[PDB]
């Protein structure tokens, strides 16, 4: 019967909780209370980027940290030259309902996906002058989320069918399938090393999956609601999670438990698009009160507020070199933030 | 000032050319009407789609009526969280809701009672606080042969009216309209469909014209 199996699972969960609590001698706040604070931050936008006519859900600049891919609900993928405020390519999407963009480390492929249950890969550096759909991938029974780019031949995505997939670019067939989530899966940030990845489901669970082995290794439950944002802390030993409630949580990888959380009583709205700087000192998250928030990712205290937007911020990212921060909201406006 | 680096001169212009295309699509999207189709169970969704199409994601419809390109999106093929992707359909011209009259007898709580909460969630949704809603009462002919045999008291214990279509249908329409908690800013266009005198497309066109008048008034000052 299943009663003894359920009891054994409960006992295993209790043992896991006891082991997690055993290695809780001190918290991160106590350690970081003796370090210099980040101080006041007054980053301002120096860009216009006025070419969209719908809500934007697009980030993942690329390796060059100069070209930025952008998508909206009008079914157009635009490549922005951030340095000169220019448009490179305009790809008309077959499905106008899309929330996913990737630029690939090579920089010659652009991936998109949404409620069409279709992952579209478009080739950029082609002999012709247009942008052709390099491949169409199907097999998901839910809205697509994230099109991360393990290699030029492998792409990992998530869907609302509580599964994650890893497909091959050359062959349009399923290669690796992950089925361990009980809710919709998004937030698939692809590590600093690309050897691993994590998925944030809608049942307050963040699960790390082995790319080669194809099995789950660690499960993190510290939220009280759905998680819709993730990062990987380019050091590679922790990751940040954002939920629809106004709180963010930093889960350590080796410790396999939460270190600390960023929250405030003055904010009640949601959180999207969690990203990290190249050093991990700052955490930037697009909140749902028409502005972004920058937190100190070591102690607790806030660092700054980026209010240069009119609608809810949906996408937000930082370049590989950490030069500037891109932010896209629902007002069809993309902003680039820099220090002074 | 800096000669614009020659090649970049040909670059920005290309970007401008893209702009020339982009707005050309955007304006094309301005004069296009987008409608959202929803339903709890079968609700005669396939029948309505087939009827209006002659004139695993989203089954879009490209049908046109009197120089007005209507867009119909079906979201019943997705089995996932509703509110995760319900904000993408905000700002549509109108939303079409289909329910079945003959669903008060079948169960799996009856189907119509299950549709009531869906209708309440859609009408009271924050993203749809200013969009007119069109409701279709399908399976009208089945009600005629079902009400005589199956009394309406099973679904409505607080009903004591005459067991006639002209009264039961009116009561059902009123009950569906009572769920509109924001009637001061939204309106419900309720209509019955049948396999004859196909005025359903004409009714949808009239509702679209009404909501277009509403939107134009919002844009042009008054109301």
């Amino acid at each position, epitope marked *: 019967e299943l009663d003894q199996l359920r009891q054994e699972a409960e006992q295993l969960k209790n043992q896991i909780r006891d082991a997690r609590k055993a290695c809780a001698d001190a918290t991160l706040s106590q350690i970081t209370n003796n370090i210099d604070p980040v101080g006041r931050i007054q980053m301002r936008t120096r860009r216009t980027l006025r070419g969209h006519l719908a809500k934007i859900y697009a980030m993942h600049w690329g390796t060059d940290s100069r070209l930025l891919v952008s998508a909206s609900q009008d079914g157009k993928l635009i490549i922005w030259d951030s340095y000169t405020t220019n448009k490179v390519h305009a790809i008309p999407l077959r499905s106008s309902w899309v929330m996913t963009c990737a630029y690939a480390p090579s920089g010659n492929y652009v991936a998109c996906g949404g409620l069409d249950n279709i992952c579209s890969i478009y080739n950029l550096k082609t002999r012709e*002058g247009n942008v052709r759909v390099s491949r169409e991938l199907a097999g998901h029974t839910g809205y697509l989320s994230c099109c991360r780019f393990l290699d030029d031949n492998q792409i990992v995505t998530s869907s609302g069918d509580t599964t994650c997939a890893l497909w091959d670019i050359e062959t349009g067939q399923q290669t690796t399938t992950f089925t361990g989530h009980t809710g919709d899966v998004m937030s698939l940030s692809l590590a600093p090393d690309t050897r691993l990845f994590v998925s944030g489901a809608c049942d307050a669970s963040a699960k790390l999956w082995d790319v080669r082995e194809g099995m789950c290794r660690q499960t993190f439950t510290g939220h009280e609601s759905d998680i819709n944002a993730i990062c990987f802390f380019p050091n590679g030993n922790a990751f940040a999670t954002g939920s629809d409630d106004a709180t963010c949580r930093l889960f350590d990888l080796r410790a396999d438990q939460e270190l600390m959380t960023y929250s405030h009583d003055n904010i009640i709205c949601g959180i999207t698009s969690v990203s990290f700087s190249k050093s991990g000192r700052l955490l930037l998250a697009g909140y749902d009160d028409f502005n972004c928030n920058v937190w100190d990712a070591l102690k607790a205290d806030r660092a700054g507020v980026l209010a240069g937007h009119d609608n809810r911020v949906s996408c937000l990212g930082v370049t590989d070199d950490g030069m500037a921060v891109a932010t896209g909201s629902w007002d069809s406006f993309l902003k680039i933030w820099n220090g002074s | 000032g800096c000669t614009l680096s*020659a090649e970049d001169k*040909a670059a920005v212009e290309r970007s401008k050319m893209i702009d020339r295309n982009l707005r050309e699509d955007g304006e094309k999207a301005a004069r296009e009407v987008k409608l959202l189709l929803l339903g709890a169970g079968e609700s005669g969704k396939s029948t309505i789609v087939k009827q209006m199409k002659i004139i695993t994601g989203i089954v879009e419809t490209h049908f046109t009526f009197k120089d007005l390109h209507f867009k119909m999106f079906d979201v019943g093929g997705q089995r996932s969280e509703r509110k995760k992707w319900i904000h993408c359909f905000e700002g549509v011209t109108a939303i079409i809701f289909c329910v079945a009259l003959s669903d008060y007898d079948l169960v799996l709580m009856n189907r119509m009672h299950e549709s009531m909460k869906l209708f309440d969630s859609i009408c009271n949704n924050k993203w749809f606080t200013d969009t007119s809603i069109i409701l279709f009462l399908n399976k009208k002919d089945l009600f005629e042969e079902k009400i005589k045999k199956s009394p309406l008291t099973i679904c409505y214990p607080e009903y004591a009216g005459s067991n006639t279509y002209e009264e039961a249908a009116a009561y059902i329409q009123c009950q569906f309209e009572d769920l509109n908690k924001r009637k001061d800013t939204k309106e419900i266009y309720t209509h019955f469909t049948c396999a004859t005198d196909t005025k359903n497309v004409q009714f949808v066109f009239d509702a679209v014209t009404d909501v277009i008048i509403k939107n134009n008034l919002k844009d042009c000052g008054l109301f």
Partner: single-chain antibody
Framework: VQLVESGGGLVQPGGSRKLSCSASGFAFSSFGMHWVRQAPEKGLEWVAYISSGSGTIYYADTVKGRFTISRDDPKNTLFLQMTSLRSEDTAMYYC??????????????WGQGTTLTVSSSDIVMTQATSSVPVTPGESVSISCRSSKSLLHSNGNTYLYWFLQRPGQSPQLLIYRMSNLASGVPDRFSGSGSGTAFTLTISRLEAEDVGVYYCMQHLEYPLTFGAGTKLE
């Protein structure tokens, strides 16, 4: 991708004639087009250029105000008409394609050429060596010089290298003196500094001899180089 041109022949001086360049295999409507004239024994020369969408059109100094150009995207063709021909216009005309975006490769593919015969402050580029023997397996260097500093105030140079095989149209080798062209062998390389550029060929094999041309792109009146020939 294919570019084929027609309209050649022998014409008396003072006449008018049009050349038609038709492209099959790529998007004509989004590509700028250039015309390059080659003398029977001298080097390549620029004629005119028309941008995508017929936005900006430029002509050479010797042909300004006399030649005319046009395109038809639905027909995917480029027409260039000349009036009042002279003896100095006797050259083979190449219709070439280019695109201008971040990390683009202008002048990537050239045309085939048409034989036209007549019965009767610009930045200059000079190559010190015009001919030098080569051997199958040794490394060689080709030097190009410019009268102006091609290093624009953005971080990149506008040098191009073109190879003309003995019987084939010129083909791009490297662009911007630092990026390799598509489909070209990795043996070729380029480097240098302001007003002094070099191109290095290492592990050279057979079936690669021809004429080498260096291009500046700082300002529209593009001027070819003298030409380096290896045999």
């Amino acid at each position: 991708v294919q570019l084929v041109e027609s309209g050649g022949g022998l014409v008396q001086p003072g006449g008018s004639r049009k050349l038609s360049c038709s492209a099959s295999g790529f998007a004509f409507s989004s590509f700028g087009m250039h015309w390059v004239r080659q003398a029977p024994e001298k080097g390549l020369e620029w004629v005119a250029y028309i941008s995508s969408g017929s936005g900006t059109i430029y002509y050479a100094d010797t042909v300004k105000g006399r030649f005319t150009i046009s395109r038809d995207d639905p027909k995917n063709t480029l027409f260039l008409q000349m009036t009042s021909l002279r003896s100095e216009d006797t050259a083979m005309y190449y219709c070439v394609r280019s695109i201008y975006y971040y990390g683009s490769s202008p002048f990537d593919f050239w045309g085939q050429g048409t034989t036209l015969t007549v019965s009767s402050s610009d930045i200059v580029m000079t190559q010190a060596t015009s001919s030098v023997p080569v051997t199958p397996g040794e490394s060689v260097s080709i030097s190009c010089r410019s009268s102006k500093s091609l290093l624009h105030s953005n971080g990149n140079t506008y040098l191009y290298w073109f190879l003309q095989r003995p019987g084939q149209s010129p083909q791009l080798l490297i662009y911007r003196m630092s990026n390799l062209a598509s489909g070209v062998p990795d043996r070729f390389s380029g480097s240098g500094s302001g007003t002094a550029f070099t191109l290095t060929i290492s592990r050279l094999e057979a079936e690669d001899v021809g004429v080498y041309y260096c291009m500046q792109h700082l300002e529209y009146p593009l001027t070819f180089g003298a030409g380096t020939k290896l045999e």
